[PDB]
């Protein structure tokens, strides 16, 4: 099978710059049978370029394409805010018509430290026999962030789950939500619950805690 | 209206079969081709296979040669994709794509795409969500709602019945080991407004017909 | 023969009785154009062409003057001024095979329409796109012929039907194909209006 | 296609001058009597203009 590889994995660029994406095939493919597609979160793929160098219908002229054989390039002359999404390259000459792994084009920004907030489990959920402690990391950049749960100074592992939002359309920051799940028994066996946040914008890990009850 | 419309969301038990529909419009179906591609939640695009509408000839990928069969019906200008022996790995979004064509010639790529059909495969049952308040601690404060233990995806969360949008972060849901989903929706507001502004999250889950309006209180 | 490779038989100097065929319920379709199907035995023409082929039931309506479709455009085209008859009958018990028959083909693609009574059996790869096919099938490069895949369990619209189109051609030459021209009894010793050989 | 205008398609003999025939009897084109029932060799004598 023909293997399609895309680069870069994450393209952090400022709106107005020139983006350049690469697509490599494991063997020589026909230029007239390669396409570039754009996909936004929760949306269907959208055809951008075909025949390696043929702009599609409705696609702005800032999108361009070049390449031949095993190496191909997708060039965006001036990056627009509506262009930050995922890009795929597909060869459709030799079956199977394999896809690439995708390239995320994010808005580049200055390093912003996250605002950290901790939320104890509500008494209504505690009535159900389960406790959920939530840690919110608000408006930070880059996306990479580290959350560690500490229950009476005991670092937790394997009992928490995280979720990260897409880059915000207004301030280009990310938000993270981490949930620690314990039983009512284990919740009542300890007193201090804290989440430690490590991030590029923090000169040192910031810890937000609460005392069970107070 | 060169369109390509797909089936609605599907929720099937493991070991069953699903048949996704894909109807064409605008162009002449009889002389085009239709491919099927899958995408797992947060993964890349995985090509499943294609079919020539006029002849019915099919080409499948190695990983779908065993459980996927692509068919078409030119009378109802619709192509189908049957996926037998479903499993949790099949939970993904499926797209169909076709070049638009007139009575004699075709486009040189896949420019028409379907909206996508999400297929969830697990042993879970339909269940409404429990909404618990994430109260703000006693210049800016954070509060929110925890939409816990529901199935299947998705839920929709709004603040002040859609009035509050600024500073709102609704996180993508995670799939717990219990088979149910958990979602958190938070909002940052000025510390002054905590005592003179009621905040109510509106959680709606259509698969279970659940409408919960929960008011967040500063303890 | 296949519809795209329709067979043509030439008929010169032979009496025929189109009454035993018109009176036969075996023929699912008996439609004539330019000449009445009842009054057929009296007509005299110098030559007769008999085109024969096999199609599916949904295409039997396409075998008529002034029709359009896959068969009419790419397989067998009848002129607007066609003077003759078209006969068709269900051949499911003969030309249908379990799993699909592979012996009868039809042209699926062609860049131009067929002229009346034109016979095209070329297997050139149809170029549907701008990129030229180089003898290899693929995207926008399809084989022009397709198999009917006749099965006995198929719908009667998709079951095999044998079609024979009789055309009667008169040229600037003596008319050598004649009808039966039956006779009657003769009576003597009575005033009669008679019609002997010529 | 306007089919409100009709014309007679079959008849056992030709019309005499200024003769008008509006009968709708089923024409027996074969040797099998029709008995007012349409079918093989049993045709409706009228046909619509296209
Ligand atoms: C059918 O269309 C083809 C070409 O259409 C192309 O593909 C379509 C999907 C759409 O994207 C169009 O904008 C494209 O142009 C026609 O073929 C062309 O015909 C012109 C005649 O003026 C000729 O000059 C071109 O060379 C032809 N190109 C190709 C690739 O064949 C064709 O005529 C159309 N047929 C009908 C019946 O509309």
Q: Which residues contact B177 (CB under 8 A, 6 or more apart)?
A: none
Residue located via tokens 């792994």:
A101
CB A144 within 8 A of CB A117: no
CA-B100 nearest atom, ligand 1: 9
Alpha-helical (H) ranges within chain C are 19-22, 70-74, 92-95
How many Cα atoms within 13 Å fall on the side-chain side of residue B72?
A: 23
Sign of CA dihedral C63, C68, C70, C74: positive
User: Which of A173, A174, A176 lies closest to A160, judged by CA?
Assistant: A176
What gap in Å lies between CA A137 and CA A200, rounded to an integer? 13
User: Which of B51, B219, B109 lies closest to A34, judged by CA?
Assistant: B109
Long-range CB contact pairs, A29-32, < 8 A, 24+:
A29/A2, A29/A69, A29/A70, A29/A91, A29/A93, A29/A94, A30/A91, A30/A93, A31/A67, A31/A68, A31/A69, A32/A93, A32/B108, A32/C131
Q: Which helix (H) or strand (E) holds A123?
A: helix A123-126
What gap in Å lies between CA A97 and CA A90, rounded to an integer? 7
User: Which of B194, B199, B191 lies closest to B215, judged by CA?
Assistant: B199
Residue A81, SS3? helix
The number of C-beta contacts closer than 8 angstroms across A and B is: 132
Q: Which helix (H) or strand (E) holds B117?
A: strand B117-121
- The DSSP bridge pattern shows strands A103-107 and A10-13 to be parallel
Is the peptide bond preceding residue B3 cis, with omega within 30 degrees of 0? no
**CB atoms near residue B176 (< 10 Å):** 15
Q: Which residues contact B204 (CB under 8 A, 6 or more apart)?
A: B155, B156, B157, B158, B210, B211, B212
CATH 2.60.40.10: does it fit domain B130-216?
Answer: yes
The beta strands (E) that lie in C108-152 are given as: 126-127, 141-142, 145-147
CA dihedral A23, A26, A27, A32 (to 10 degrees): -30
What gap in Å lies between CA B10 and CA C125, rounded to an integer? 41
Provide the terminal-to-terminal Cα distance of chain A, rounded to the nearest Å: 62
Is the peptide bond preceding residue B154 cis, with omega within 30 degrees of 0? yes
Residue C145, SS3? strand
What gap in Å lies between CA B140 and CA C168, rounded to an integer? 97
Please give the CATH architecture assigned to the domain spanning B3-121: Sandwich (2.60)
CA-B102 nearest atom, ligand 1: 1
| B103 in contact with ligand 1, CB cutoff 6 A | yes
- CA distance, residue C82 to nearest chain D CA (Å): 19
- A14 in reach of chain C (CB within 8 A): no
**No. of helices (H) and no. of strands (E), chain C:** 3, 9
Residue nearest to atom 7 of ligand 1 (CA): B107
- Our measurement of the distance from residue C109's CA atom to the centroid of its chain's CA atoms, rounded to an integer in Å, reads 21
What gap in Å lies between CA C79 and CA B52, rounded to an integer? 32
Return the DSSP state at A18: -
Q: Which two tokens stand for residue A197?
A: 């946040």
- The DSSP bridge pattern shows strands A46-50 and A4-7 to be unpaired
- The DSSP bridge pattern shows strands B10-12 and A145-151 to be unpaired
CA-B106 nearest atom, ligand 1: 9
- Residue B124: C-alpha distances to residues B127, B175, C47 (Å): 9, 11, 78
Q: Which two tokens stand for residue C92?
A: 């499911």
CB C59 within 8 A of CB C193: no
CA dihedral C131, C132, C136, C140 (to 10 degrees): 40
- The DSSP bridge pattern shows strands A103-107 and B156-159 to be unpaired
Residue located via tokens 């929110």:
B144
Q: Which residues contact B57 (CB under 8 A, 6 or more apart)?
A: B51
CB A34 within 8 A of CB A52: yes
Query: Are A and D neighbours with ≥3 CB pairs closer than 8 A?
Result: no
Q: Which helix (H) or strand (E) holds A124?
A: helix A123-126
- D14 in reach of chain C (CB within 8 A): no
Q: Which two tokens stand for residue B34?
A: 């239709």
Query: Are C and A neighbours with ≥3 CB pairs closer than 8 A?
Result: yes
Residue located via tokens 């159900």:
A128
What gap in Å lies between CA A151 and CA A195, rounded to an integer? 9
**CB atoms near residue A2 (< 10 Å):** 16
**How many residues belong to chain B?**
219
What gap in Å lies between CA A78 and CA A60, rounded to an integer? 11
**No. of helices (H) and no. of strands (E), chain A:** 2, 17
Q: Which residues contact B161 (CB under 8 A, 6 or more apart)?
A: B200, B202
CB B58 within 8 A of CB B51: yes
What gap in Å lies between CA B109 and CA A47, rounded to an integer? 8
Q: Which residues of C touch A92 (CB under 8 A)?
A: 139
Residue ranges of domains in chain B:
3-121, 130-216
- The DSSP bridge pattern shows strands D6-8 and D46-48 to be antiparallel
- Residue B68: C-alpha distances to residues A172, B52, B72, C93 (Å): 41, 16, 13, 35
What gap in Å lies between CA C190 and CA A199, rounded to an integer? 129
Q: Which residues contact B109 (CB under 8 A, 6 or more apart)?
A: A35, A47, A50, A51, A56, A92, B99
- CA distance, residue C135 to nearest chain A CA (Å): 15
What gap in Å lies between CA B172 and CA B41, rounded to an integer? 11
- The DSSP bridge pattern shows strands A46-50 and C47-56 to be unpaired
Query: Checking phi first, is residue B124 left (phi over 0); if not, alpha (psi -120 to 50) or beta?
Result: beta
**CB atoms near residue C118 (< 10 Å):** 11
Q: Please, what is the Cα angle at D8 between D5 and D11, to 5 degrees?
A: 175
| B104 in contact with ligand 1, CB cutoff 6 A | yes
What gap in Å lies between CA B205 and CA B186, rounded to an integer? 18
**Same fold: B3-121 with B130-216:** yes
Residue nearest to atom 13 of ligand 1 (CA): B107
Q: Which residues of C touch D27 (CB under 8 A)?
A: none
- The DSSP bridge pattern shows strands D6-8 and A46-50 to be unpaired
User: Which of C55, C86, C85, C89 lies closest to C71, judged by CA?
Assistant: C55
**CB atoms near residue D21 (< 10 Å):** 12
Q: Please, what is the Cα angle at B98 between B94 and B103, to 5 degrees?
A: 155
Alpha-helical (H) ranges within C29-185 are 70-74, 92-95
Q: Which two tokens stand for residue A31?
A: 């230029």
How many Cα atoms within 13 Å fall on the side-chain side of residue B120?
A: 18
Return the DSSP state at A188: H
Cross-chain Cβ contact C129/B33 below 8 Å: no
Residue located via tokens 């709708």:
D24
Q: What is the 3-state secondary structure (H, E, C) of A138-174?
A: EEEECCCEEEEEEECCEECCCCEEEEECCCCCCCCCE
Q: Which two tokens stand for residue A6?
A: 């895309």
Residue B69, SS3? strand
What gap in Å lies between CA D4 and CA D24, rounded to an integer? 16
- Residue B113: C-alpha distances to residues A106, A214, B92, C50 (Å): 24, 55, 16, 50
Q: Using what technique was this structure determined?
A: cryo-EM
Q: Which residues of C touch B28 (CB under 8 A)?
A: none
User: Which of A100, A104, A91 lies closest to B45, judged by CA?
Assistant: A100
Sign of CA dihedral C96, C100, C102, C104: positive
Residue nearest to atom 28 of ligand 1 (CA): C130
**Resolution in angstroms for this experimental structure?**
4.6
What gap in Å lies between CA A113 and CA C66, rounded to an integer? 77
What gap in Å lies between CA D44 and CA D24, rounded to an integer? 7
CA-C130 nearest atom, ligand 1: 30
């Amino acid at each position: 099978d023909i293997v399609m590889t895309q680069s870069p994995g994450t393209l952090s660029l400022s709106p107005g710059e020139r983006a350049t994406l690469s697509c490599r095939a494991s063997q020589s493919v026909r230029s007239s049978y390669l396409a570039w597609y754009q996909q936004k979160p929760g949306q269907a793929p959208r055809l951008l370029i075909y025949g390696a160098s043929r702009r599609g219908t409705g696609i702005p002229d800032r999108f361009s394409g070049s390449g031949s054989g095993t190496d191909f390039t997708l060039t965006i002359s001036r990056l627009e805010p509506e262009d930050f999404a995922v890009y795929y390259c597909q060869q459709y000459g030799s079956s199977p018509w394999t896809f690439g792994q995708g390239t995320k084009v994010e808005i580049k920004r200055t390093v912003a430290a996250p605002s950290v907030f901790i939320f104890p489990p509500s008494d209504e959920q505690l009535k159900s026999g389960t406790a959920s402690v939530v840690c919110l990391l608000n408006n930070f950049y880059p996306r990479e962030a580290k959350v560690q749960w500490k229950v009476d100074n005991a670092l937790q592992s394997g009992n928490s789950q995280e979720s990260v939002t897409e880059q915000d359309s207004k301030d280009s920051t990310y938000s993270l939500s981490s949930t620690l799940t314990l039983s009512k028994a284990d919740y009542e066996k300890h007193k201090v619950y804290a989440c430690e946040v490590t991030h590029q914008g923090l000169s040192s890990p910031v810890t937000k805690s609460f005392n069970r009850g107070e | 209206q060169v369109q390509l419309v797909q089936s609605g969301p599907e929720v099937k038990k493991p070991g069953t079969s699903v048949k996704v529909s894909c109807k064409a419009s605008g162009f002449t179906f009889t002389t085009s081709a239709v491919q099927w591609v899958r995408q797992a939640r947060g993964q890349r695009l995985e090509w499943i296979g294609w079919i020539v509408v006029g002849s019915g000839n099919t080409n499948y990928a190695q990983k779908f040669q065993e459980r996927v069969t692509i068919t078409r019906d030119m009378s109802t200008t619709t192509a189908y994709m049957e996926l037998s022996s479903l499993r949790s790995e099949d939970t993904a979004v499926y797209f169909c794509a076709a070049p638009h064509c007139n009575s004699t010639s075709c486009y040189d790529a896949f420019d028409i795409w379907g909206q996508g059909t999400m297929v969830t495969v697990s042993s879970a049952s339909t269940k409404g969500p429990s909404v618990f308040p994430l109260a703000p601690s006693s210049g800016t404060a954070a509060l929110g709602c925890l939409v816990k233990d529901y199935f299947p995806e998705p839920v929709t969360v709004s603040w002040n019945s859609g009035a509050l949008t600024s500073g709102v972060h609704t996180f993508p849901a995670v799939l717990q080991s219990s088979g149910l989903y958990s979602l958190s929706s938070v909002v940052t507001v000025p510390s002054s407004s905590l005592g003179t502004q009621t905040y109510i999250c509106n959680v709606n889950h259509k698969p279970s017909n659940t409408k919960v309006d929960k008011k967040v209180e500063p303890k | 023969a296949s519809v795209y490779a329709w067979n043509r038989k030439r008929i010169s100097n032979c009496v025929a009785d189109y009454s035993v065929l018109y009176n036969s319920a075996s023929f699912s379709t008996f439609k004539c154009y330019g000449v009445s199907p009842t009054k057929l035995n009296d007509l005299c023409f110098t030559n007769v062409y008999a085109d024969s082929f096999v199609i599916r039931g949904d295409e039997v309506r396409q075998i008529a003057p002034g029709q359009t479709g896959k068969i009419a455009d790419y397989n067998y085209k009848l002129p607007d001024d066609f003077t003759g008859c078209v006969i068709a009958w269900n051949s499911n018990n003969l030309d249908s095979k379990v799993g699909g028959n592979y012996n009868y083909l039809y042209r699926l693609f062609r860049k131009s329409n067929l002229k009346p009574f034109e016979r095209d059996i070329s297997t050139e790869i149809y170029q549907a796109g701008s990129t030229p096919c180089n003898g290899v099938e693929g995207f926008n490069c399809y084989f022009p012929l397709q198999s009917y895949g006749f099965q006995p369990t198929n719908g009667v619209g998709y079951q095999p039907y044998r079609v024979v189109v009789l055309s009667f051609e008169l040229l600037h030459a003596p008319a050598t194909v004649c009808g039966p021209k039956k006779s009657t009894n003769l009576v003597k010793n009575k005033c009669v209006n008679f019609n002997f050989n010529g």
